[PDB]
């Protein structure tokens, strides 16, 4: 695919935000990643907002 493309991940489990800056999503939901970081939390966008989420709750939809 196109190089250095923004990562696309799919939620594998439901998640309820524990903090204001965290995302809430349901299994099956698609998130566009804005920040990949070690430590178990990534940042992404979903449904119009940007927030943090558990990286172990998602699986990247890999190219190509």
């Amino acid at each position: 695919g196109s190089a250095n493309s923004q990562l696309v991940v799919r939620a594998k489990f439901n998640f309820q935000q524990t903090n204001e800056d965290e995302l809430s999503f349901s299994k099956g939901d698609v998130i566009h990643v804005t920040r990949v970081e070690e430590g178990g939390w990534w940042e992404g966008t979903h449904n119009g907002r940007t927030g943090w989420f558990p990286s172990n709750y998602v699986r990247e939809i890999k190219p190509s």
Binding site: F13, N14, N19, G39, G40, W41, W52, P54, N56, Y57
Partner: peptide, 8 residues
């Protein structure tokens, strides 16, 4: 049993 998120 969903995975446990690490502390922030």
């Amino acid at each position: 049993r969903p995975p446990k998120p690490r502390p922030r």
